[PDB]
Nucleic acid binder design. Structure first.
Ligand SMILES: [Mg+2]
Ligand SMILES: [Mg+2]
Ligand SMILES: [Mg+2]
Ligand SMILES: [Mg+2]
Ligand SMILES: [Mg+2]
Ligand SMILES: [Mg+2]
Ligand SMILES: [Mg+2]
Ligand SMILES: [Mg+2]
Ligand SMILES: [Mg+2]
Ligand SMILES: [Mg+2]
Ligand SMILES: [Mg+2]
Ligand SMILES: [Mg+2]
Ligand SMILES: [Mg+2]
Ligand SMILES: [Mg+2]
Ligand SMILES: [Mg+2]
Ligand SMILES: [Mg+2]
Lengths: 148, 56, 93, 203, 162
RNA sequence: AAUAUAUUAAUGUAUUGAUAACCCUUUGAACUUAAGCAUAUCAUUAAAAGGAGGAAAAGAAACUAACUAGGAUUUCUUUAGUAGCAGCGAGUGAACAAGAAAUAACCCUCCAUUGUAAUCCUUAAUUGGAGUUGUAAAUGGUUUAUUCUAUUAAUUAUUAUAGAGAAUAUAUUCGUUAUUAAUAGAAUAGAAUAAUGUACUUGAGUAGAGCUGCUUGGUAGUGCAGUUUGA
């Protein structure tokens, strides 16, 4: 298999390793951890990490992750949610039947905007359609129902 | 690392490395606690923390 | 983010039922209660009152109800236990 | 019935009857030592619910505690350290005074085992408690199924390990999110399993 | 720290208290060994017991069904068993649970009839050891994962659908 | 001998010492990091003391949640280096839900049929006691069969259910492999012998307040304790 030689094997024979002669390699020049953010490491915090110091916002004890669950898919991928067998049957032969999609049965809750694939009417059930998703579903001739 | 050695310090025309204290035998006065000392532990001792298996 | 989603909420409909338990952990016994309520009215006659309950009666003889309420609030903890005790002492005075 | 007339009498400890009777027994206790032996318990209906049975091999004793904090003992107030921890006076003990009453009577009698204890009466200087102790090696208690559990091996000296109901409360056990500490066994068992990182095989 | 990195957060006692998993393949051999040795002690009886079907609490897992702990005695009253008799057969009983609906009660009541129609009962253990009947080893009548189904509807009813 | 209990100064019964790993309580630091240092961190650590078992501790909701609702304890994965705590600096730090291993529930405290203490220890002996200020405790180990563990003793080709390995010299043995016996222990099943009445109990100087100190991620108790007061 493919391999690479370490850098220590090329460094035997030289009086130091790659650490110079004037500025030697000592233990902990400059402090341990992230110390000194206000005095001498000020220029490193300014270039790479603003907003490290200070408070902001309102503090909420014990956020419940399960109560605030929300998953979103675009409006475009609703024809992809139909399983592979019956998705074919709507195309070639049953061209007049209207499919009914339950987004909670697949694990999605919110529907963000997008453009539908084909020009046939559909029936979609979810929670909290966005304002663009209400518009481009009804443009084809569909209907949206808020579902428990 | 079984013994209880300590360095003697400077001012004796002798090295700085830790010497076995005590007296009464040939052992007392010899070096200890270093990788370059005889009957001393090695630097970077091996351990069972090392990864033994890979994932394919 | 939970505020706007809570304004529109629909509950899934299920038919309810109410069935009492076969073996409860607590069976209310009517005979066992009435002996406790009858025995307490007998013991309070032979024995007397507490030394803080005797001072609360003589204050209520002077109709200092607003003074007697702060006297029992310092002794017992809750405000509910004060108003349950004043009804026991206003009968006996 | 007669279990209820007694329990209501011995409940009100500020009445005219109980203030009369408690004054006489305190003057009887000062002539005695630290631990002495009584025959029948003073509070009958209270002691019966804690498991007491009028059988041979069940014995009752009474001890005393001095009712105050205990002072730390250094030479001149020198703890030889930082100033974060140099307080001496205001330090409260770990267990209740019911628990320290059991360790005194349990140490003096290595013959017996302990069950329970309760409060009797107070003074200016002391607090009085009554302890109930039972012989394991009597043949009358080795035979009945009702107290056959106390003759096991693991029931020796339940006071020194904190298993009696008097000193069990100070460890803080229960259900729910309020007892998030001691989530397994004891306090120290919960700490050890939380700090140690797990190194699995494949990672 | 002399380049563009994230702020590192590594605790000081991370590598000082370590538990190592060296005994992982040796542990799994032992657990299958005592499981197989327990099977010969009760030969005609199955290895596991019966469990009910419940729903999961929160809204993230609201559409999932799961094997619960035990049966309430009111569902046994519909099937006709008594709780001192049903414990001797492989049935689990829970007493802390409370009844809520009719749909969750008619489901568990139908499930108890299917278990009763399969078990037999012999006289004594000498009779039972002599008969050679295949002994089940897995879970007893588990749930199975659902497959979603899309219904096709006509064009007229979409103006009046619910 | 000492500290205690029982019978009548004597006799019987129980405890005392060893540990250097895991377990339950008590007491309890500093070096170090913050590029100084005094709150903080190292640390609910090291040293020290007390107490038991082959495991110990815990354990049958005065719970979690806001759903179409779950269900005693323990351990693993994950939530998560997250919510939060802190000279808001350095740094420290949980739980529900979800997937699994393993599953088991019960007993005292009243007025237990008062047409009768029906109980309990001890003695060869209703012999001597205890007990109404309340004691209540059903009993047989004989025999047969099967399975598992530990220790001893015996037989093994020169073709091979034996090419694992040792020893001698430059074709032989011990064994391996595969079988039995003896002793001890454990579990399951059958047959036979013994044995079956009446039982409406729910936990006080506790829970909680005022002042005071420690602990926790718990923020104005998350938990504990002293003093005063106390349903
Ligand atoms: Mg150099
Ligand atoms: Mg440099
Ligand atoms: Mg220079
Ligand atoms: Mg060496
Ligand atoms: Mg216990
Ligand atoms: Mg160090
Ligand atoms: Mg410093
Ligand atoms: Mg420095
Ligand atoms: Mg310094
Ligand atoms: Mg600390
Ligand atoms: Mg165990
Ligand atoms: Mg145990
Ligand atoms: Mg900490
Ligand atoms: Mg009784
Ligand atoms: Mg041979
Ligand atoms: Mg209660």
């Amino acid at each position: 298999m493919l391999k690479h030689v370490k850098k220590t094997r090329k460094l035997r024979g030289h009086v130091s390793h790659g650490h110079g002669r004037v500025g030697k390699h000592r233990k902990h020049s400059g402090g341990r951890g992230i110390c000194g953010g206000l005095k001498h490491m000020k220029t490193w915090f300014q270039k790479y990490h603003p907003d490290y110091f200070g408070k902001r916002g309102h503090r909420i004890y014990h956020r419940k992750k399960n109560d605030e669950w929300a998953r979103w898919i675009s409006a475009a991928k609703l024809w992809s949610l139909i399983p592979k067998e019956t998705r074919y049957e709507l195309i070639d032969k049953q061209q007049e039947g209207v499919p009914v999609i339950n987004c909670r049965d697949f694990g999605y809750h919110v529907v963000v905007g997008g453009e539908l694939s084909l020009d046939r009417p559909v029936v979609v059930k979810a929670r909290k359609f966005t304002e663009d998703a209400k518009e481009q579903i009804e443009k084809v001739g569909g209907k949206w129902i808020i579902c428990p | 690392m079984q013994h209880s050695a300590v360095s003697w310090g400077t001012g004796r025309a002798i090295a700085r490395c830790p010497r076995i204290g005590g007296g009464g035998s040939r052992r007392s006065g010899q070096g200890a606690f270093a990788n370059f000392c005889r009957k001393g532990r090695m630097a970077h001792p091996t351990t069972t923390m090392r990864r033994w298996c890979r994932k394919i | 983010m939970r505020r706007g989603l809570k304004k529109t909420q629909v509950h899934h409909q299920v038919t309810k039922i109410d069935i009492p338990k076969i073996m409860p952990k607590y069976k209310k016994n009517s005979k066992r209660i009435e002996e406790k309520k009858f025995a307490r009215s007998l013991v309070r006659e032979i024995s007397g009152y507490a030394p803080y309950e005797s001072k609360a009666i003589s204050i209520l003889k002077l109709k200092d109800i607003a003074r007697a309420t702060i006297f029992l609030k310092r002794r017992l903890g809750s405000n509910k236990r004060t108003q349950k005790k004043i009804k026991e002492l206003q009968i006996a005075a | 019935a007669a279990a209820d007339y007694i329990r209501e009498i011995q409940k009100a400890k500020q009445s005219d009857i109980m203030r009369y009777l408690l004054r006489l027994r305190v003057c009887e206790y000062r002539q005695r030592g630290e631990v002495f032996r009584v025959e029948r318990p003073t509070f009958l209906q209270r002691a019966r619910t804690l498991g007491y049975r009028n059988k041979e091999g069940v014995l009752c004793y009474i001890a005393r505690v001095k009712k105050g904090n205990r002072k730390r003992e250094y030479n001149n107030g020198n703890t030889r350290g930082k100033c974060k921890n140099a307080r001496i006076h205001q330090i409260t003990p770990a267990v209740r005074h019911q628990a320290t009453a059991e360790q005194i009577v349990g140490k003096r009698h290595p013959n017996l085992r302990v069950l329970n204890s309760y409060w009797v009466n107070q003074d200016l200087v002391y607090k009085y408690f009554e302890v109930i102790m039972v012989d394991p090696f009597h043949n009358a208690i080795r035979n009945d199924p009702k107290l056959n559990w106390i003759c096991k091996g693991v029931m020796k000296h339940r006071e020194c390990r904190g298993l009696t109901s008097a000193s069990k409360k100070s460890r803080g056990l229960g259900h729910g999110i309020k007892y998030n500490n001691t989530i397994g066994g004891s306090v120290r068992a919960c700490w050890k399993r939380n700090v140690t990182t797990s190194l699995r095989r494949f990672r | 720290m002399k380049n563009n990195h994230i702020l590192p957060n590594n605790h000081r006692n991370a590598m000082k208290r370590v538990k190592e998993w060296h005994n992982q393949p040796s542990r799994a051999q032992r657990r299958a060994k005592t499981r197989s040795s327990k099977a010969k002690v009760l030969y005609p009886a199955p290895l596991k017991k019966l469990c009910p079907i419940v729903r999961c609490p929160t809204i993230r897992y609201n559409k999932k069904q799961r094997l619960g702990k035990g049966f309430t005695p009111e569902e046994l009253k519909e099937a006709g068993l008594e709780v001192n008799y049903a414990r001797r057969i492989g049935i689990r009983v829970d007493n802390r649970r409370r009844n809520m609906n009719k749909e969750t009660l008619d489901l568990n009541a139908q499930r108890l009839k299917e278990y009763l129609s399969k078990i037999t009962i012999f006289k004594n253990g000498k009779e039972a050891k002599e008969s050679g009947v295949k002994q089940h080893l897995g879970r007893i009548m588990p749930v199975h994962k659902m497959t979603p189904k899309v219904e096709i509807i006509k064009k007229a009813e979409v103006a009046s659908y619910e």
